[PDB]
């Protein structure tokens, strides 16, 4: 079967150039176009360009203004997209794709490569309580960290019911913040302990925070 | 030259219900491709050449149309069918449609609203974060209005929403109001006002600083 496998995530400084690879298997590499698709949240899917391996031919989306270059190495069955002069707008998931056997639908897709363009440096989060307010709600605020991700659990994985860990927001500072909450019976607030376990690996931040009603 | 319009942008279907989503073209097109996407994964070819099902696509899915109107149909809605569906045609600009997000339909549920003051620990760092939780609501659409001493806040808050819950089909929202410690100490009443379909009038949860 036809398979497309992409290179891993890229963390980039503004103004840098990124090169993403797409290894193709299960067909004759020189007889099909490898195409590239951009996906930002709130923008859908955008066609960027393509390369026909071994021909020297490539095609471009005009709105990229020559910043995107598409090449291929026939010896290793790998296609490449290079995007120069990176900005915050270029932060997206990038897919390589190929046409079907007897149809021009994109039947075969790579797993996607996440490119993050940021000027921020590695920072550990501060963990703040969201103190309890029939049913009570409590939580933890995991504020001012870089980069993604963070791993959050409650009571070492024992508490899963009624837990909502929210998508992180990217602040104007360039640092992330997320919240994790749990709704519980209010009668158990005096008997049952509630601890959020927070792990941010790049900063070596490992925090267990007990959350209780304020004195 | 040819624009694709997917109507509606959000489609809600109960389990068992028949589902039809339309991709309208501004001029005649000879085919429509359809792609399924779930959160965190690549789009999958779902229906190609208007009507042909990709390998592994269940028989409940079908596609049809001609000219200026094409559609994707599910005979009976299942939980696993909840995804975004993109229509696509190479003669169109842009080539992909904006997508129809298909969710599970349930009865209207009002959010349970909770406000959280900033912790004393945070106030040492020079910044104050005020958090509002909107818990287990349907539909997804909700408005959060932050009020500081009755003054409506704008540009100084961020929010995110969880994926539809697999058990009760509800959504949850978290909003953070961020201000400096200096700004925080100069005001008294902090309020999160919530607008939602299941609320006849907006509900306000509030606290007084220090109390």
């Amino acid at each position: 079967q036809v398979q497309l496998q992409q290179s891993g995530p890229e963390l980039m400084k503004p103004g840098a150039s990124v090169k993403i690879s797409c290894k193709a298997t299960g067909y004759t590499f020189s007889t099909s176009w490898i195409e590239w698709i951009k996906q930002r949240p709130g923008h859908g899917l955008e066609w960027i360009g393509e390369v026909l391996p071994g021909s020297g031919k490539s095609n471009h989306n005009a709105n990229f203004k020559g910043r995107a270059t598409f090449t291929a190495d026939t010896a290793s069955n790998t296609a490449y997209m290079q995007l120069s002069s990176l900005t915050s707008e270029d932060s997206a998931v990038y897919y390589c794709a190929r046409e079907g056997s007897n149809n021009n639908a994109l039947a075969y897709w790579g797993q996607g490569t996440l490119v993050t363009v940021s000027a921020a440096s590695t920072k550990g989060p501060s963990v703040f309580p969201l103190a309890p307010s029939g049913t009570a709600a409590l939580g933890c605020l995991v504020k001012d960290y870089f980069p993604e991700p963070v791993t959050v659990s409650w009571n070492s994985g024992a508490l899963t019911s009624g837990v909502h860990t929210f998508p992180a927001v990217l602040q104007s500072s360039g640092l992330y913040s997320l919240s994790s909450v749990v709704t519980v019976p209010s009668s158990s607030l005096g008997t049952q302990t509630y601890i959020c376990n927070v792990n941010h690996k790049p900063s070596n931040t490992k925090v267990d925070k007990k959350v209780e009603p304020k004195s | 030259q040819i624009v694709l319009t997917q109507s509606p942008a959000i489609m809600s279907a109960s389990p068992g219900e028949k589902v039809t989503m339309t991709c309208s073209a501004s001029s005649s097109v000879s085919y429509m491709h359809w792609y399924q996407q779930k959160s965190g994964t690549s789009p999958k070819r779902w229906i190609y050449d208007s009507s042909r099902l990709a390998s592994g696509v269940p028989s409940r899915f079908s596609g049809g149309g001609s000219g200026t109107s094409y559609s994707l149909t599910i005979s009976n809605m299942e939980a696993e069918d909840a995804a975004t569906y993109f229509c696509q045609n190479w003669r169109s600009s842009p080539t992909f449609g904006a997508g129809t997000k298909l969710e599970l339909k349930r009865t209207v549920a009002a959010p349970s609203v909770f406000i959280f003051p900033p912790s004393d620990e945070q106030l040492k760092s020079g910044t104050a974060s005020v958090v509002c939780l909107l818990n287990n609501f349907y539909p997804r659409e909700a408005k959060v209005q932050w009020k500081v001493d009755n003054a409506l806040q704008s540009g100084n808050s961020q929010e995110s929403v969880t994926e539809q819950d697999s058990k009760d089909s509800t959504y949850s929202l978290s909003s953070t109001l961020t201000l400096s410690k200096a700004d925080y100490e100069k005001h008294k009443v902090y309020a999160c006002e919530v607008t939602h379909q299941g609320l006849s009038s907006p509900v306000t949860k509030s606290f007084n600083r220090g109390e």
Partner: peptide, 16 residues
Amino acid sequence: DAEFRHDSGYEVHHQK
């Protein structure tokens, strides 16, 4: 976006 994409030859042969 896909204005300058390659042609594959899957054109419908129009009768009318």
